[PDB]
Amino acid sequence: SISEKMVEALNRQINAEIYSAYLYLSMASYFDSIGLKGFSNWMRVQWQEELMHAMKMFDFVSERGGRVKLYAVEEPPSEWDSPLAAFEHVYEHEVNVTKRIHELVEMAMQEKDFATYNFLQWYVAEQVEEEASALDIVEKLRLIGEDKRALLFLDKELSLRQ
Amino acid sequence: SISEKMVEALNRQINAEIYSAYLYLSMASYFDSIGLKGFSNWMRVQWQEELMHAMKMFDFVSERGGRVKLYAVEEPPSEWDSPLAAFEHVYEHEVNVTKRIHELVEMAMQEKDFATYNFLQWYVAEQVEEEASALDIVEKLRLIGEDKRALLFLDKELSLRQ
Amino acid sequence: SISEKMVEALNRQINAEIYSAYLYLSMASYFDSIGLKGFSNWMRVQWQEELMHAMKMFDFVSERGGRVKLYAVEEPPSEWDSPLAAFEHVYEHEVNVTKRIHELVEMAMQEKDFATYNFLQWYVAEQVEEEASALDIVEKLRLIGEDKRALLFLDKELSLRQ
Amino acid sequence: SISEKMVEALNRQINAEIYSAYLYLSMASYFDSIGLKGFSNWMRVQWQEELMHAMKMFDFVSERGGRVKLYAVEEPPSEWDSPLAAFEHVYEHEVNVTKRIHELVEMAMQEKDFATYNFLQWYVAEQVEEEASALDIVEKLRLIGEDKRALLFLDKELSLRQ
Amino acid sequence: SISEKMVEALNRQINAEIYSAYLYLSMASYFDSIGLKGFSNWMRVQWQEELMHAMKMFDFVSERGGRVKLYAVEEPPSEWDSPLAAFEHVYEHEVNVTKRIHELVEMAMQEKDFATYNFLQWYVAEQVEEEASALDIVEKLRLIGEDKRALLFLDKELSLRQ
Amino acid sequence: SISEKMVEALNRQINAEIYSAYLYLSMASYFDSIGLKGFSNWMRVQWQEELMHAMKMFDFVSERGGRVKLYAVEEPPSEWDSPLAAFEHVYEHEVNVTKRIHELVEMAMQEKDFATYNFLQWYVAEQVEEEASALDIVEKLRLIGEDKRALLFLDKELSLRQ
Numbered sequence: 001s002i003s004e005k006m007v008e009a010l011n012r013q014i015n016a017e018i019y020s021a022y023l024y025l026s027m028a029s030y031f032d033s034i035g036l037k038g039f040s041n042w043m044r045v046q047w048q049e050e051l052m053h054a055m056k057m058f059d060f061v062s063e064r065g066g067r068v069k070l071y072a073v074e075e076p077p078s079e080w081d082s083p084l085a086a087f088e089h090v091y092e093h094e095v096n097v098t099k100r101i102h103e104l105v106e107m108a109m110q111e112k113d114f115a116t117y118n119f120l121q122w123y124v125a126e127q128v129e130e131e132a133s134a135l136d137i138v139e140k141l142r143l144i145g146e147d148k149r150a151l152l153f154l155d156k157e158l159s160l161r162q
Numbered sequence: 163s164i165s166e167k168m169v170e171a172l173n174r175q176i177n178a179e180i181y182s183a184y185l186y187l188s189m190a191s192y193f194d195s196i197g198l199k200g201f202s203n204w205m206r207v208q209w210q211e212e213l214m215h216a217m218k219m220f221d222f223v224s225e226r227g228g229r230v231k232l233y234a235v236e237e238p239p240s241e242w243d244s245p246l247a248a249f250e251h252v253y254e255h256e257v258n259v260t261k262r263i264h265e266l267v268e269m270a271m272q273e274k275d276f277a278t279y280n281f282l283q284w285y286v287a288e289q290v291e292e293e294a295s296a297l298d299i300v301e302k303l304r305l306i307g308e309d310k311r312a313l314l315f316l317d318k319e320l321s322l323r324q
Numbered sequence: 325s326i327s328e329k330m331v332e333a334l335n336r337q338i339n340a341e342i343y344s345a346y347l348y349l350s351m352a353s354y355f356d357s358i359g360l361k362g363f364s365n366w367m368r369v370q371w372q373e374e375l376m377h378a379m380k381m382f383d384f385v386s387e388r389g390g391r392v393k394l395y396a397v398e399e400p401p402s403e404w405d406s407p408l409a410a411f412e413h414v415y416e417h418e419v420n421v422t423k424r425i426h427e428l429v430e431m432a433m434q435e436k437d438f439a440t441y442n443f444l445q446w447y448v449a450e451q452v453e454e455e456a457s458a459l460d461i462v463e464k465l466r467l468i469g470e471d472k473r474a475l476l477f478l479d480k481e482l483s484l485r486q
Numbered sequence: 487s488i489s490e491k492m493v494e495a496l497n498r499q500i501n502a503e504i505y506s507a508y509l510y511l512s513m514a515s516y517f518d519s520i521g522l523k524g525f526s527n528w529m530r531v532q533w534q535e536e537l538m539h540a541m542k543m544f545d546f547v548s549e550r551g552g553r554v555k556l557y558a559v560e561e562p563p564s565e566w567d568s569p570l571a572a573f574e575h576v577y578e579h580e581v582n583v584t585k586r587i588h589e590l591v592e593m594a595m596q597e598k599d600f601a602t603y604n605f606l607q608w609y610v611a612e613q614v615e616e617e618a619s620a621l622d623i624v625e626k627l628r629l630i631g632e633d634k635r636a637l638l639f640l641d642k643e644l645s646l647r648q
Numbered sequence: 649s650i651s652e653k654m655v656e657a658l659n660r661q662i663n664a665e666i667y668s669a670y671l672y673l674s675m676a677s678y679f680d681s682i683g684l685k686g687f688s689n690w691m692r693v694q695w696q697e698e699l700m701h702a703m704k705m706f707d708f709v710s711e712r713g714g715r716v717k718l719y720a721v722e723e724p725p726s727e728w729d730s731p732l733a734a735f736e737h738v739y740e741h742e743v744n745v746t747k748r749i750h751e752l753v754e755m756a757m758q759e760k761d762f763a764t765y766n767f768l769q770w771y772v773a774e775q776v777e778e779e780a781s782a783l784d785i786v787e788k789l790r791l792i793g794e795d796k797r798a799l800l801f802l803d804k805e806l807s808l809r810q
Numbered sequence: 811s812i813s814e815k816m817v818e819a820l821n822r823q824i825n826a827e828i829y830s831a832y833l834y835l836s837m838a839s840y841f842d843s844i845g846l847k848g849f850s851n852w853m854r855v856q857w858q859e860e861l862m863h864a865m866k867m868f869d870f871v872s873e874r875g876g877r878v879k880l881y882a883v884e885e886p887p888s889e890w891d892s893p894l895a896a897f898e899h900v901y902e903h904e905v906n907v908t909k910r911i912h913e914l915v916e917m918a919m920q921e922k923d924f925a926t927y928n929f930l931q932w933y934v935a936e937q938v939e940e941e942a943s944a945l946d947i948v949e950k951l952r953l954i955g956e957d958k959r960a961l962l963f964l965d966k967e968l969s970l971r972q
């Protein structure tokens with residue numbers, strides 16, 4: 001039932017979820033390098049979260065009788081201009097992930113593959129949260145601007161994530 | 163104090179630990195594809211293990227004052243002639259990972275980087291277990307030869323790993 | 325079989341550890357003098373911790389069959405230009421302690437005194453943390469420069485240390 | 487990959503650990519014979535402890551891919567002029583086991599067998615304790631001299647070891 | 649009052665109990681050599697159990713005021729054709745150990761040494777179990793023959809012993 | 811992965827399991843017709859049980875992503891010479907159902923279809939029980955013979971089945 005075309009694409013998106021993890025891990029290294037252990041922590045938590053996103057899709061492809069094929073994970077970028085620019089890139093990347101999910105929804109429907117549609121609804125809801133979390137911190141870094149105490153305050157708040 | 167040479171090698175090995183995890187994840191797919199869910203499980207656990215291995219080094223490079231550069235993760239192989247060949251590939255890959263850790267140990271000696279030498283001793287000990295665990299299962303699968311009832315028994319046991 | 329050369333190098337290091345403690349107690353007074361009770365708390369904790377490093381080495385010297393000679397503890401300096409300057413001194417000092425530790429490690433290697441070589445690996449690993457904890461505060465102090473509200477945020481953080 | 491000459495050496499040291507136990511068990515019969523039930527206890531405990539030392543190495547030869555050959559265990563001596571002489575024998579014995587372990591460490595270094603080098607570090611630190619425990623009791627027994635009431639106070643203390 | 653002839657005879661039977669331990673230890677190696685870590689476990693446990701047998705009798709000789717002499721433990725054998733042959737050697741060995749204990753019993757009665765007779769009744773019952781446990785596994789392995797799965801099923805049964 | 815071959819074979823076994831049900835329901839009517847309400851109840855319970863056997867296969871064919879086709883269920887026979895003759899038909903019939911299952915097992919193993927092999931193992935075990943149960947009552951009736959209080963005794967006993 002699950003079509004070979006639907007598998008390939010889910011396999012794409014599995015790779016996109018892993019590269020996001022890996023992107024966030026590179027950011028963990030960047031925030032590490034500029035003293036911000038709380039931001040670093042957030043990123044490490046996001047890395048593991050995106051890996052979990054990938055695995056939940058890895059397991060669904062196998063369950064449905066599809067075959068997971070893993071592809072290369074690209075070398076991510078490694079520097080950003082500022083914590084603000086880091087999170088702005090998070091936001092934009094997550095909006096891109098949200099696009100690619102909306103398309104998998106659309107493909108599922110064309111193929112009348114109701115199981116893959118229903119499953120992707122998890123990721124549709126999850127992307128709403130991803131974008132909003134990312135936006136919310138972007139807004140906070142914009143008011144903070146150059147104010148070093150506010151920056152360190154946000155960094156503590158972020159160190160608390162699990 | 164940590165040299166650039168040494169930071170490079172460690173960043174490389176971090177990439178290799180992540181690759182190892184990714185190979186084992188591939189094998190988990192292979193094993194799903196021939197209905198050995200226990201072998202699959204064993205791999206899925208070893209994938210989490212190797213990622214953890216990677217992170218302990220990722221954190222160490224940054225504590226030593228160096229900077230983690232992340233590199234592409236190679237697309238891994240996707241098929242194996244049999245369960246025996248896949249664990250034969252496992253054992254061998256592990257013997258190589260060991261060789262890599264031994265070369266890192268020697269570099270640390272050459273450079274008198276006592277901190278990195280001591281740190282690496284954990285991997286010296288871990289690679290002993292890695293090899294032995296893989297070899298034991300290669301042996302089991304040799305003893306089992308062609309008997310598919312015995313394969314499923316070993317499969318159910320491997321499904322018990324957490 | 326522990327040599328005289330070794331027993332004296334270890335006794336001198338016992339003195340260096342106790343002086344490191346004492347130095348950090350002098351910095352505690354300095355930080356009290358300028359209203360930074362959290363910086364003061366950090367130094368106090370570090371003072372107990374360094375005393376604890378000396379005591380582990382004290383016990384070991386006798387465990388090996390040696391005798392601890394105690395030497396004078398030098399009057400430490402009592403003024404620094406700034407928090408940043410004081411923590412730059414902590415860092416350069418701990419880099420020097422490391423350098424002494426590594427000397428002992430070499431001396432023990434050179435003497436085939438394996439028991440002492442092994443005992444000191446704990447100090448090899450401890451010094452990694454010691455340099456990192458201090459460099460992290462130096463860097464935060466740099467990031468902060470003259471902003472006194474941020475300095476006070478950081479003082480509060482250090483008042484948490486146990 | 488462990489060499490033959492390293493396996494054989496380890497297996498000789500397994501034998502020596504077992505002999506050590508057996509020597510200390512003979513000593514327990516000695517002490518029973520002169521009514522000193524605490525010195526007896528101390529030895530029975532150390533006979534178990536040396537067996538544990540042997541089994542730890544027995545397991546490691548197997549976990550490296552080697553195979554353990556077991557050897558005759560020589561008939562230990564059965565008499566000593568006095569409690570002081572028995573514990574002197576214990577001391578000179580343990581200093582000799584330490585020598586044996588140190589030779590093992592050297593061999594491992596020469597062959598670049600880092601895995602064995604690292605495993606043996608446990609026996610390097612254990613021998614530090616073994617020498618000091620036996621030495622303290624030797625020194626106590628010298629302090630004590632021919633006083634029989636004091637000897638029995640020591641005997642009672644030694645009966646508390648578990 | 650226990651006699652000299654009895655004390656020697658119990659002293660030899662200890663030796664025999666320690667040898668049996670050592671024999672079983674040798675088999676543990678042999679089963680470890682051929683992949684059967686569950687059989688190996690059984691053998692480690694029997695190795696401990698026979699040491700407990702020896703010590704119980706070591707203590708009894710003491711309790712009666714005899715002196716335990718310790719003799720060389722003999723180098724054991726180290727290969728067997730198969731799991732079956734090994735357990736046949738176990739049973740035959742244990743049947744022989746029964747014979748020795750039935751001889752100590754008849755000696756005891758001859759000397760009217762009731763306290764040694766009563767003491768030996770524990771070993772008389774224990775041997776009934778020793779024989780019956782060995783024979784049960786011989787019987788099971790014959791029925792098993794060359795069937796690999798069934799072999800592995802029993803090796804897991806044996807991994808359970810404590 | 812599950813073959814067309816294996817699916818049609820399972821669907822056919824499903825038919826066989828529903829027919830078994832219906833055969834047992836037809837006997838419940840027989841036993842009802844001759845005043846044996848306990849035998850009837852036994853059949854009604856066995857009818858629900860074989861329906862459950864069916865549905866577990868229906869669900870399994872469908873989980874593995876194959877399509878259950880439903881075939882006609884044959885008119886079963888409706889009379890028997892006696893309770894004994896009736897339970898002899900149950901036995902023969904169950905021995906036949908065992909034949910079919912063992913055939914489904916070998917086909918699975920041919921196609922190396924290990925999920926299906928493992929799933930059928932429940933039925934192999936279940937059939938061992940079916941046969942033993944039927945056989946046992948067959949035997950209890952050979953004994954009862956013409957004896958009427960013992961037939962009513964057996965009849966109460968089968969009332970009890972839930």
Ligand SMILES: [Fe+3]
Nearest residue numbers: 017050053097
């Ligand atoms: Fe995601």
Ligand SMILES: [Fe+3]
Nearest residue numbers: 020094097130
């Ligand atoms: Fe995301």
Ligand SMILES: [Fe+3]
Nearest residue numbers: 049126129130
């Ligand atoms: Fe999320």
Ligand SMILES: [Fe+3]
Nearest residue numbers: 179182212215
């Ligand atoms: Fe690893």
Ligand SMILES: [Fe+3]
Nearest residue numbers: 182256259292
């Ligand atoms: Fe590994």
Ligand SMILES: [Fe+3]
Nearest residue numbers: 211288291292
């Ligand atoms: Fe491991």
Ligand SMILES: [Fe+3]
Nearest residue numbers: 341344374377
């Ligand atoms: Fe220190």
Ligand SMILES: [Fe+3]
Nearest residue numbers: 344418421454
């Ligand atoms: Fe320090």
Ligand SMILES: [Fe+3]
Nearest residue numbers: 373450453454
């Ligand atoms: Fe510290």
Ligand SMILES: [Fe+3]
Nearest residue numbers: 503506536539
């Ligand atoms: Fe020892």
Ligand SMILES: [Fe+3]
Nearest residue numbers: 506580583616
């Ligand atoms: Fe010792």
Ligand SMILES: [Fe+3]
Nearest residue numbers: 535612615616
């Ligand atoms: Fe000890």
Ligand SMILES: [Fe+3]
Nearest residue numbers: 665668698701
């Ligand atoms: Fe025994």
Ligand SMILES: [Fe+3]
Nearest residue numbers: 698742745778
């Ligand atoms: Fe026995």
Ligand SMILES: [Fe+3]
Nearest residue numbers: 697774777778
């Ligand atoms: Fe027993």
Ligand SMILES: [Fe+3]
Nearest residue numbers: 827830860863
């Ligand atoms: Fe059925």
